[PDB]
Amino acid sequence: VQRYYKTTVPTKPKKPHDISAFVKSALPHLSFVVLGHVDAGKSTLMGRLLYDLNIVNQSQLRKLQRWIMDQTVTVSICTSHFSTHRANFTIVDAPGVPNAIMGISQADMAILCVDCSTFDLDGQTKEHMLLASSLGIHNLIIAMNKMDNVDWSQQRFEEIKSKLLPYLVDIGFFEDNINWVPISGFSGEGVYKIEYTDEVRQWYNGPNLMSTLENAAFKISKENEGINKDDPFLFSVLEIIPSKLALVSGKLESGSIQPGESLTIYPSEQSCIVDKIQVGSQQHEETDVAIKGDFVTLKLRKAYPEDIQNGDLAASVDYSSIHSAQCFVLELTTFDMNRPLLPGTPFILFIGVKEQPARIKRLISFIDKGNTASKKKIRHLGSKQRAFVEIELIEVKRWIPLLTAHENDRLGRVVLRKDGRTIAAGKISEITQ
Ligand SMILES: Nc1nc2c(ncn2[C@@H]2O[C@H](COP(=O)(O)OP(=O)(O)O)[C@@H](O)[C@H]2O)c(=O)[nH]1
């Protein structure tokens, strides 16, 4: 308590492995979150998917056609793992907006499920895409859905897209990271195992949902081919399973870990040794190498669970960039707000799977072009602007570990809300420790 054992000298692995080797040899993996409006087909689509996967029954599916996550101490996010012969996947979902944030934060990319039936670019669709890119998601698959109620009309498909695409781009996306797939969650056409109808093939000639997913995965798996031992290990603690030798579950956001190697957890700053890396939907199956992107469970020696919590951060013992703070600077981008932001204006900071009250402490400067700090004086921050800002945490019960977005692009992002409205996104630029 007064001090946990802590080191900055790497222990070696019981059975050293060639990371680059192990990556190549290994199957690609992708995690994704399934967003979309309330009546867009999210669950019938999910059902259909699992069904083609022989994970859902033929009747389990007829019931759904009139839970699904459940079927496949504090829980932060739900995961469901699955596999094809080409790739491994991990559906991510929160249980229970704050819940969307959790899902989005741990997912590699998003599938945006859209109702094509007879377009109104609506409230919670836009919300989700806004959170998606605020939170670090670059890749999308827009599952253009419910094609039957438009008889697979290329005319309509292309019409909805011409509305949505520009929005997605404005909001912060790039057109080549967006993939557009026509499907029917109900007929299962284009999802996985039921092929596109010939009528449909004469205009849509790109891949189906599943293949598109596998494609994503491969794209990812390649970047991870570089991974060295000169690469930091980063790991979001996502759940702590009770002991009666602790079990820690989370997502690697960087590098790799093998049994024998060591890690420090923040903010507790304990240095534990990992002696088993459990993985798979079970999580009895074990590997000798977890790498970035993998959802896994570490079986830790020298761990003190009372002082570990969801949303904590583990890293290489020689990695010294995670910090806790009252104050830090946000490169802040602002949406449409009711009132402007002023020094002292409080809000809730959302960050990874944690949320936290805070207030603006300083308005430091507008951002004119590129990244330059405009000499224009700034007494208040209004809607649809960007500025460097100093934030202060209030009523802190426990330190939040922070990483700047230069250190890591994903972990370094935060979403700001006040009075129930998503008001701004931010990149952590600097930490005033
Ligand atoms: N015509 C058609 N209807 C669908 C399709 N997929 C879902 N639906 C229906 O549209 C509504 C969307 O509800 P649901 O599946 O729960 O989507 P969610 O509530 O947004 O997750 C339900 O009545 C679905 O059964 C589809 O591919 N074609």
CB 2, CB 60: distance < 8 Å: no
Cβ count within 10 A of residue 349: 22
* Same domain membership, residue 255 and residue 359: no
Instruction: State the Cα angle at 252 between 97 and 433, rounded to 5°.
Output: 75
* Same domain membership, residue 187 and residue 157: yes
CATH number at residue 354: 2.40.30.10
- Ligand 1 contacts CB of residue 146 (under 6 A): yes
Structure tokens at 427: 């990149």
Residue nearest to atom 19 of ligand 1 (CA): 39
Q: Which atom of ligand 1 is nearest to the CA of 184?
A: 27
Q: Which atom of ligand 1 is nearest to the CA of 42?
A: 21
- Ligand 1 contacts CB of residue 152 (under 6 A): no
* Same domain membership, residue 214 and residue 360: no
CATH number at residue 179: 3.40.50.300
CA distances from 65 to 43, 68, 233, 295 (A): 10, 12, 44, 31
Cβ count within 10 A of residue 245: 12
The number of distinct structural domains making up the chain is 3
Residue type at 389?
V
* Same domain membership, residue 124 and residue 260: no
* Same domain membership, residue 331 and residue 310: no
Closest CA to 333 of 191, 398, 428, 238: 428
Q: Which atom of ligand 1 is nearest to the CA of 189?
A: 27
* Same domain membership, residue 260 and residue 199: no
Residues 86 and 210: their CA atoms lie apart, in Å, by 10
Q: Which atom of ligand 1 is nearest to the CA of 113?
A: 20
- Ligand 1 contacts CB of residue 145 (under 6 A): yes
The residue among 222, 246, 262 that closes a domain is 222
Residues 249 and 186: their CA atoms lie apart, in Å, by 35
- CA dihedral sign of residues 32, 74, 407, 415: positive
* Same domain membership, residue 188 and residue 167: yes
Structure tokens at 105: 């934060």
Q: Which of 44, 184, 189 to mutate to test the pocket of ligand 1 (most atoms within 8 A of CB)?
A: 44
- Ligand 1 contacts CB of residue 185 (under 6 A): yes
Residues in the chain: 433
CB 312, CB 267: distance < 8 Å: yes
- CA dihedral sign of residues 9, 15, 18, 24: negative
**Domain range enclosing 287:** 228-323
Cβ count within 10 A of residue 393: 19
Q: How was this structure determined?
A: X-ray
CA of 83 to the centre of ligand 1 (A): 24
Residues 67 and 46: their CA atoms lie apart, in Å, by 11
Collapsing DSSP to helix, strand or coil, 267 comes out as: coil
Specify the DSSP element, H or E, that contains 111: strand 109-115
* Same domain membership, residue 152 and residue 21: yes
In the 3-class helix/strand/coil scheme, how is 338-369 assigned residue by residue? CCCECCCCEEEEEECCEEEEEEEEEEEEECCC
Residues 40 and 144: their CA atoms lie apart, in Å, by 9
Closest CA to 81 of 92, 94, 70, 68: 92
Question: Read out DSSP for 376-420?
Answer: S--S-B-TT-EEEEEEEE-S-SSPPEE--TTT-TTTTEEEEEETT
Closest CA to 306 of 433, 393, 398: 398
Specify the DSSP element, H or E, that contains 332: strand 327-334
* Same domain membership, residue 2 and residue 147: yes
Residue nearest to atom 25 of ligand 1 (CA): 65
Cβ count within 10 A of residue 103: 28
Residues 176 and 158: their CA atoms lie apart, in Å, by 16
Q: Which atom of ligand 1 is nearest to the CA of 37?
A: 20
CA of 183 to the centre of ligand 1 (A): 11
Instruction: State the Cα angle at 94 between 90 and 97, rounded to 5°.
Output: 130
The residue among 207, 222, 237 that closes a domain is 222
CA of 41 to the centre of ligand 1 (A): 4
The residues facing 387 across adjacent strands are 332, 366
The answer for 391, left when phi > 0, alpha when psi is -120 to 50, beta otherwise, is: beta
Resolution, expressed in angstroms to one decimal = 3.0
- Interaxial angle between packed helices 42-52 and 209-223, expressed in degrees from 0 to 180 and rounded to the nearest 10: 80
Specify the DSSP element, H or E, that contains 389: strand 386-393
* Same domain membership, residue 159 and residue 130: yes
In degrees rounded to 5, what are phi and psi of residue 343? -55, 125
* Same domain membership, residue 290 and residue 241: yes
**CA-CA-CA-CA torsion for 106, 107, 109, 111, nearest 10 degrees?**
-130
* Same domain membership, residue 265 and residue 166: no
The residue among 222, 249, 275 that closes a domain is 222
Task: Give the residue carrying structure tokens 């092929």.
Answer: 195
- Ligand 1 contacts CB of residue 43 (under 6 A): yes
